[PDB]
A paper describes a structure:
The precursor PdDfsB is cleaved by subtilisin to yield biologically active Slf, and the chemical gradients of both proteins between two growing colonies could be accurately modelled. However, remarkably, the [name] gene is widely distributed across Gram-positive and to some extent Gram-negative bacterial kingdoms (PFAM entry DUF1706). PdDfsB adopts a four-helical bundle core structure that belongs to the DinB structural superfamily. The most strongly conserved region of PdDfsB is the C-terminal helix, which is present within the mature Slf sequence.
The third, well-populated clade contains exclusively Gram-positive bacteria such as Listeria and some Streptococcus species. During purification of the two Streptococcus [name] homologues ([name] and Streptococcus pneumoniae), both monomers and stable dimers could be identified. We attempted to crystallise both forms independently and only the dimers yielded diffraction-quality crystals. We solved the crystal structure of a [name] [name] dimer (SaDfsB) by molecular replacement using a pruned CdDfsB structure as the search model. Interestingly, the source of dimerisation is via the C-terminal helix, which flips out of one monomer and inserts into the other in a mutual fashion.
Numbering used by the authors:
A (entry chain B), B (entry chain A): 13 to 150, 153 to 184
Write the structure that this text describes.
Amino acid sequence: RTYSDKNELKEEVLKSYKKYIAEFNDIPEKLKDLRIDEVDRTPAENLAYQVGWTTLILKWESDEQSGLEVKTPTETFKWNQLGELYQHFTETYASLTIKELTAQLNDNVDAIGNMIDSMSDEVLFKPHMRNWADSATKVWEVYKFIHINTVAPFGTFRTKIRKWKKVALK
Amino acid sequence: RTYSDKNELKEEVLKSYKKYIAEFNDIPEKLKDLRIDEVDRTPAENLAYQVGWTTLILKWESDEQSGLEVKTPTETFKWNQLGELYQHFTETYASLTIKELTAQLNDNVDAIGNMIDSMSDEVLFKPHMRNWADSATKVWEVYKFIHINTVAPFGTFRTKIRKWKKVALK
């Protein structure tokens, strides 16, 4: 286990989200669709990606609550249709303002906060407790493994060591 | 794909690593094994975890590239044994000083950046390009899926939008 309890997970979600969404404060609406060569996504596409995926994970849990046997990311799109799914995210939130996208993403992140609260320690942290989690596990590229063993723990274990320093180095 | 290209991946690896490893600069060696109730790991255990996993990913790649069989995660502990694996990491590496751990992890992160530089875009970002990557996916809990759809992209797409602003709002 890498998060110790649901409180720690919730705090990391909240704090990473705040750092992320704060960056869009200074972006003019007229530039929401501005694409540069150095970065693949526009500000609008950047936010739309988060709105799309956070909507889906909430849907999975909802559908599973209903007894639905959920193996697909969505209505329509395969686990091999992700490039097309991201495309779908972009048009669904196309011509939405940064302000509007931010409002919706805020709502989703809170819903996720509530989902964590409403989940016992067990269904959050033990295997085979949601069939959508099992199913979604059913192909990973090299770059995902690199991220999962560098960027991801370098973030979460940095939070851990800072908490250790708070208590130990006083 | 979430990362624009391999340089964007390498940048997030190096940036997140620098943030992480900087936290250990003011931890006295004498307190490296000090355990407290509020965090699950000591500073040496925290480092040892990273040393263990970064060593493994480098080993899987090296071994596969010379035509050897690769047993993931190890040839002794398989995937139902990650608690045992982490505990092996700690016996192997946590006895080392913070300075020694930091030297090894520095070297591993350097090697991972070099590995990324040396890989084609296809090998990094397409499925079924490494046997070790396919082998590693053949059970994830709910909390992992929550992290992967909030904390992880909130970090990665924050790096995107910060880069975007540096070019677009100069």
